[PDB]
Amino acid sequence: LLKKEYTGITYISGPLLFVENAKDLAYGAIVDIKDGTGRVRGGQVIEVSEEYAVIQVFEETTGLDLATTSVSLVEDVARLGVSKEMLGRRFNGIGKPIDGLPPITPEKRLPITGLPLNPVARRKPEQFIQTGISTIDVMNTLVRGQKLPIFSGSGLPANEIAAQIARQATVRPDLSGEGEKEEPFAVVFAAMGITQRELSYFIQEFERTGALSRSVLFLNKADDPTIERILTPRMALTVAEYLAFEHDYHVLVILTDMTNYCEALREIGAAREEIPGRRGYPGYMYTDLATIYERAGVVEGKKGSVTQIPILSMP
Amino acid sequence: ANEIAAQIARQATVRPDLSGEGEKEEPFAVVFAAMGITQRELSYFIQEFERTGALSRSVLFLNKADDPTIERILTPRMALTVAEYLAFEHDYHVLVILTDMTNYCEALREIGAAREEIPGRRGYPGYMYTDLATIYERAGVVEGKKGSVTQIPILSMP
Amino acid sequence: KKEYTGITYISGPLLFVENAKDLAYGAIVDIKDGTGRVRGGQVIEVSEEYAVIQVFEETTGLDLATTSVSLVEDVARLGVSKEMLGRRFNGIGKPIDGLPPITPEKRLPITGLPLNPVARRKPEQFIQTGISTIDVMNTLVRGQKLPIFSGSGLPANEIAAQIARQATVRPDLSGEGEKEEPFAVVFAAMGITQRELSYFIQEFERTGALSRSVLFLNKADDPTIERILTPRMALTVAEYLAFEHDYHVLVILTDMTNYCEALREIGAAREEIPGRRGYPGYMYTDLATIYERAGVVEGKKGSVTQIPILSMPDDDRTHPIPDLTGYITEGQIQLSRELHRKGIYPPIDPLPSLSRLMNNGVGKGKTREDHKQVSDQLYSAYANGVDIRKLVAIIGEDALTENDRRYLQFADAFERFFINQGQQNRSIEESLQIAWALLSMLPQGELKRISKDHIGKYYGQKLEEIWGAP
Amino acid sequence: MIQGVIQKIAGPAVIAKGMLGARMYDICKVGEEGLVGEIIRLDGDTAFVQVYEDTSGLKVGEPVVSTGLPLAVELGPGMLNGIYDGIQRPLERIREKTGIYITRGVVVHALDREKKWAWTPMVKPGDEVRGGMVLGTVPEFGFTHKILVPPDVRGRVKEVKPAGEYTVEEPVVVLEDGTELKMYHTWPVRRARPVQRKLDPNTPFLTGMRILDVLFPVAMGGTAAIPGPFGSGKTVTQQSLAKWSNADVVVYVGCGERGNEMTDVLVEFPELTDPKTGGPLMHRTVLIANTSNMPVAAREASIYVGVTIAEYFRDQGFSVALMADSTSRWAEALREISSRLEEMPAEEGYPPYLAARLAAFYERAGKVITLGGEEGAVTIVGAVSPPGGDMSEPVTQSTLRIVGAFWRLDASLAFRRHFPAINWNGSYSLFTSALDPWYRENVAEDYPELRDAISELLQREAGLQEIVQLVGPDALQDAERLVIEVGRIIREDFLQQNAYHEVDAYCSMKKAYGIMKMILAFYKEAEAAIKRGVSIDEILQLPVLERIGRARYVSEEEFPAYFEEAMKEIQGAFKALA
Amino acid sequence: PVQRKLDPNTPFLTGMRILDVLFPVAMGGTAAIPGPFGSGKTVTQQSLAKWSNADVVVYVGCGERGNEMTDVLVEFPELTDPKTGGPLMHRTVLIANTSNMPVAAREASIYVGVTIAEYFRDQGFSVALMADSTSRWAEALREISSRLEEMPAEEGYPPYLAARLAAFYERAGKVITLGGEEGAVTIVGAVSP
Amino acid sequence: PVQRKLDPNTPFLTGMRILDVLFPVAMGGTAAIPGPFGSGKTVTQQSLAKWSNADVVVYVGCGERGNEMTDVLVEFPELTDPKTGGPLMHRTVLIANTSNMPVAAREASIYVGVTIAEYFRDQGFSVALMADSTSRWAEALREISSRLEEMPAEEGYPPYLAARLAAFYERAGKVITLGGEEGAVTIVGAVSP
Amino acid sequence: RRVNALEQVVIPGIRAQIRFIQQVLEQREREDTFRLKRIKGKIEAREAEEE
Ligand SMILES: Nc1ncnc2c1ncn2[C@@H]1O[C@H](COP(=O)(O)OP(=O)(O)O)[C@@H](O)[C@H]1O
Ligand SMILES: Nc1ncnc2c1ncn2[C@@H]1O[C@H](COP(=O)(O)OP(=O)(O)O)[C@@H](O)[C@H]1O
Ligand SMILES: Nc1ncnc2c1ncn2[C@@H]1O[C@H](COP(=O)(O)OP(=O)(O)O)[C@@H](O)[C@H]1O
Ligand SMILES: [Mg+2]
Ligand SMILES: [Mg+2]
Ligand SMILES: [Mg+2]
Secondary structure class of D328 (helix, strand, coil): helix
Neighbours of chain C (3+ CB pairs under 8 A): D, F, G
Which of D60, D104, D260 minimises the CB distance to C46?
A: D60
Strands D319-325 and E30-34: unpaired
Length of chain A: 315
Which of B99, B108, B112 is closest to B154 using CA atoms? B99
Chains that touch B (3 or more CB pairs under 8 A): E, F, G
**D348 to chain G: which residues are within 8 Å by CB?**
26
Q: Annotated binding site of F for ATP, which residues?
A: 35-42
Q: Taking an 8 Å Cβ-Cβ cutoff, which residues of chain D contact chain A?
A: 20-25, 40-44, 70, 190, 192, 198, 200-201, 343-347, 352-353, 355-356, 359-360, 363, 366, 397, 400-402, 404, 428, 430
List the residue whose alpha carbon is closest to atom 6 of ligand 3: F40
Ligand 1 contact via D231 beta carbon (within 6 Å): yes
Specify whether the CB–CB gap between D521 and D570 falls below 8 A: yes
Q: Residues C1-12, buried b or exposed e (16+ Cβ, 10 A)?
A: eeebeebeeeeb
In DSSP notation, E105-158 reads HHHHHHHHHHHHHHHHHTTT-EEEEEES-SHHHHHHHHHHHHHTTPPP-BTTB-
Q: Contact at 8 Å (CB) between D26 and D37?
A: no
D373: closest CA among D320, D321, D315, D309?
D315
The DSSP line for C202-259 is HHHHTTTGGGGEEEEEEETTS-HHHHHHHHHHHHHHHHHHHHHH--EEEEEES-HHHH
Contact D4, D17 (CB under 8 A): yes
> What is the distance between the alpha carbons of residues F56 and F70, in angstroms, rounded to a whole number?
20
Chain G nearest CA to E139, separation (Å) = 17
Residues with CB under 6 A from ligand 3: F 37-43
Q: B101 CA distance to ligand 6 centroid (A)?
A: 22
Chain G residues within 8 angstroms (CB to CB) of chain F? 36, 39-40, 42-43, 46
Q: Could you give the CA distance from residue A51 to residue D122 in angstroms, rounded to a whole number?
A: 60
Q: Does G43 touch chain C (CB under 8 A)?
A: yes
Q: Is E37 assigned a ligand-binding role in the annotation?
A: yes
Q: Does G42 sit within 8 Å of B116, measured CB to CB?
A: yes
Residue type at C129 in one-letter notation: T
For residue A127, the tally of other CB atoms under 10 A from its CB is 17
Q: Is E28 annotated as a binding residue?
A: no
Sequence length of chain E is: 193
Contact D318, D286 (CB under 8 A): no
Q: Check if the beta carbon of residue D16 is closer than 8 Å to that of residue D7.
A: yes
8 Å CB contact of C114 and D102: yes
**Cα-to-centroid distance, F72 and ligand 1 (Å):** 71
Name the nearest CA neighbour of D340 among D384, D305, D300.
Answer: D300
Measured distance CA(C207)–CA(F79) in Å, rounded = 51
Q: Provide the CA A83 distance to its chain's centre, in angstroms.
A: 16
D236 CB near ligand 1 (under 6 Å): yes
Cα–Cα distance between C416 and C469 in angstroms, integer? Answer: 12
The backbone torsions φ and ψ at residue D426, rounded to the nearest 5 degrees and listed phi first, read -100, -10
Of A123, A276, A295, the CB nearest to E70: A123
CA dihedral (D346, D347, D349, D350) positive or negative = negative
CB C48 within 8 A of CB C21: yes
* Residue among F93, F90, F123, F126 nearest F10 (CA): F126
Return the SS3 of A52.
Answer: coil
Q: Are strands D405-406 and D63-66 parallel, antiparallel or unpaired?
A: unpaired
Cα–Cα dist A154/A138, whole Å = 27
C113 and D CB contact within 8 Å: yes
| Whole-number Å distance between alpha carbons of D321 and A4 | 51
What whole-number distance in Å separates Cα of residue D327 and Cα of residue D294?
Answer: 16
E11 is in an annotated binding site: no
Q: For F1, which DSSP code?
A: -
For the CA of E36, the closest atom of ligand 2 is 22
Distance between CA E160 and CA E148 in Å, rounded? 14
What residues in F contact B126, CB-CB < 8 Å? Answer: 139, 142-143, 146, 156
Q: How many residues does chain F have?
A: 193
Reported as half-sphere exposure (CB side, CA atoms, 13 A), residue F82 has a value of: 14
CA distance D427 to B29: 78
| Domain boundaries defined on chain E | 1-193
Contact D274, D245 (CB under 8 A): no
Pick the closest to residue A285 from A237, A230, A226 (CA basis): A230
Chain G residues lying within 8 Å of C273, measured CB to CB: 33, 36-37, 40
Nearest CA to ligand 1 atom 10: D233
- Please give the helix or strand (H or E) that residue G44 lies within, else none: helix G11-46
Q: Do B39 and E162 touch (CB under 8 A)?
A: no
- From the list F23, F17, F21, F91, the residue with the least C-alpha distance to F53 is F91
Specified resolution (Å): 2.8
- E34 Cβ closer than 6 Å to some ligand 2 atom: no
Give me the sign of the Cα torsion angle D35, D41, D42, D46: negative
Distance CA A315, CA C367 (A): 53
- Supply the Cα-derived Rg of chain F in whole angstroms: 17
Q: Is A184 exposed, middle or buried (0-12, 13-18, 19+ CB in 10 A)?
A: middle
Q: Is F67 helix (H, G, I), strand (E, B) or coil?
A: helix
Detail the DSSP E strand segments found in chain E. Answer: 4-6, 30-34, 56-62, 92-97, 126-131, 173-176, 182-191
Q: For residue C116, give the nearest of D95, D340, D349 by CB distance.
A: D95
| Pick from A13, D351, D48, A263: nearest CA to C281 | D351
Q: How remote is the C-alpha of D214 from its chain's centroid?
A: 19
Tell me the CA distances in angstroms from D79 to A96, D94, D288, D313, one per residue in order. Answer: 40, 16, 11, 10
Residue A153 forms contact with E (CB below 8 Å): no
Q: Is the preceding peptide bond at C346 cis, omega within 30 degrees of 0?
A: yes
- Which chains are within 8 Å of G by 3+ CB pairs? A, B, C, D, E, F
| A234: CB partners within 8 A, 6+ apart | A112, A113, A114, A292
> What is the spatial distance between Cα D507 and Cα D208, in angstroms, rounded to a whole number?
5
- Find all residues with CB under 8 Å of D263, minimum gap 6, and list them: C117, C120, C121, C122, C295
How many whole angstroms separate alpha carbon C428 and alpha carbon F106?
59
Residues on chain G bordering chain A, Cβ-to-Cβ distance under 8 angstroms: 23, 26-27, 30, 34, 37
C12 touches chain F (CB under 8 A): yes
D237 alpha carbon to ligand 1 midpoint, in Å?
8
**Alpha-helix residue ranges (DSSP H) falling in F91-134:** 105-121
Q: Quote the strand ranges of chain F, DSSP E.
A: 4-6, 30-34, 56-62, 92-97, 126-131, 173-176, 182-191
Supply the DSSP string of B93-120, one letter for each residue. Answer: EEEEEES-HHHHHHHHHHHHHHTTPPB-
Which helix (H) or strand (E) segment holds residue E14: the answer is none
CB B9 within 8 Å of CB B30: yes
**Rounded distance, CA D495 to CA D419, Å?**
8
Decide: C108 and C146 in contact? Cβ < 8 Å: no
Q: Which amino acid is at B82?
A: V
Question: Would you give the DSSP letter of residue D265?
Answer: H
Element (H, E) at D129: strand D128-129
**For a pocket test of ligand 1, which of D209, D210, D236, D252 has the largest count of ligand atoms closer than 8 A to its C-beta?**
D236
Q: Are F52 and F128 a contacting pair, CB within 8 Å?
A: yes
| Chain D residues within an 8 Å CB radius of A273 | 344
Question: If you count them, how many residues does chain B have?
Answer: 158
Taking the CA atoms of F43, F45, F48 and F49 in sequence, report the sign of the dihedral they define.
negative
Q: Please state the separation of Cα F151 from the chain's center in Å.
A: 30
The C-alpha atoms of residue A64 and residue A33 are separated, in whole angstroms, by 9
DSSP secondary structure letter of residue D534 = -
Ligand 2 neighbourhood includes E41 CB (under 6 angstroms): yes
Contact C175, C470 (CB under 8 A): no
